[PDB]
Design a protein around this nucleic acid. Sequence first.
DNA 1: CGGCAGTACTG
DNA 2: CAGTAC
DNA 3: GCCG
Length: 327
Amino acid sequence: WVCAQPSSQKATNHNLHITEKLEVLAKAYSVQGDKWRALGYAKAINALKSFHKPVTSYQEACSIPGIGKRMAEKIIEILESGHLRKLDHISESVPVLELFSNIWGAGTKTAQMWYQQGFRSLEDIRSQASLTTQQAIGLKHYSDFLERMPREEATEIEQTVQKAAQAFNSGLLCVACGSYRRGKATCGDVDVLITHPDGRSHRGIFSRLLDSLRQEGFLTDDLVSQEENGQQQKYLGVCRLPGPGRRHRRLDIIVVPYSEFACALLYFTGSAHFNRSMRALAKTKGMSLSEHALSTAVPGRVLPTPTEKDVFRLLGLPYREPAERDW
DNA sequence: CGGCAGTACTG
DNA sequence: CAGTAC
DNA sequence: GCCG
Ligand SMILES: O=c1ccn([C@H]2C[C@H](O)[C@@H](COP(=O)(O)NP(=O)(O)OP(=O)(O)O)O2)c(=O)[nH]1
Ligand SMILES: [Cl-]
Ligand SMILES: [Cl-]
Ligand SMILES: [Mg+2]
Ligand SMILES: [Mg+2]
Ligand code: NA
Ligand code: NA
Ligand code: NA
Ligand code: NA
Ligand code: NA
């Protein structure tokens, strides 16, 4: 279980010659849509990254959780020969599929369709492809959404959101989660969680907050924002700080009831692989873990989780600080 | 043999 | 719903 | 791809 161990085990990778090659195959399977095969590669890569020493034998590889017969044979190949033959036999469509699936709002199905239709470049997409509203925004910001910002800029973005929120309710709590809370030096976006400790004033704040951030010109595009019926949980969009030298940055906001704060904070801090491991563990124990609650198997019972530590405790896991969840 | 996390928008 | 995303 |  990745979630049972500190992610600092990957800081010293004794198998990088192997993992940098498996990573190429993992991405090739992912963009072609073979999600489960790609998942097995991703888990094997993490297992090899955390292992305490270089793997040197077939029996040694198979003994590692996440590494089976097939993955062992690839490891043996890279050790003996220095190369992996399959890397010379990846589908020729893969670079273009990767190019296309890096448009926000286009995944493997859209990328494969565009490839079948004869498109090979973003110029082809721009000039000939049918784009959803989201995809057109993704394409307009193609390079910007592939950039990571310095964490200092993420702080400024969080502060912009926080000041706008607290201006109409001074009791609102705002926390930047994701890679920022995990202590990374750069951030792909800013993930802001908003709640209110009184348990009720979080309701209806999206309309006021988004209007405020629009009034000051900070939000530039909206990707996901269901503003019609008042039940909105998330905003996914684009912002830009004022002044020269600024880039468009992705911004995600969630507003959660205080009763769900610990589970929402745990979810939104991640990492994604950490969450998936923790959720899979919870299931083996007759529980279910989401961004709303830790509950028993089904209508199940909601377990009491006032803090993140309580979730770890109820799953039998030692607590990990956010920086140690970077799987 | 079949799951592989659990959930929220979009159209 | 399938697709996509956090 | 891996796992129970
Ligand atoms: O598939 C996912 C993706 C994200 N998440 C959670 C964990 C993640 O840390 C958080 C924010 O998602 P981001 O896509 O913003 N990733 P993160 O902030 O970890 O890294 P970065 O934004 O720097 O790429 O949402 C999941 O649970 N499942
Ligand atoms: Cl291939
Ligand atoms: Cl907490
Ligand atoms: Mg993020
Ligand atoms: Mg995000
Ligand atoms: Na290691
Ligand atoms: Na194994
Ligand atoms: Na995409
Ligand atoms: Na909308
Ligand atoms: Na599954």
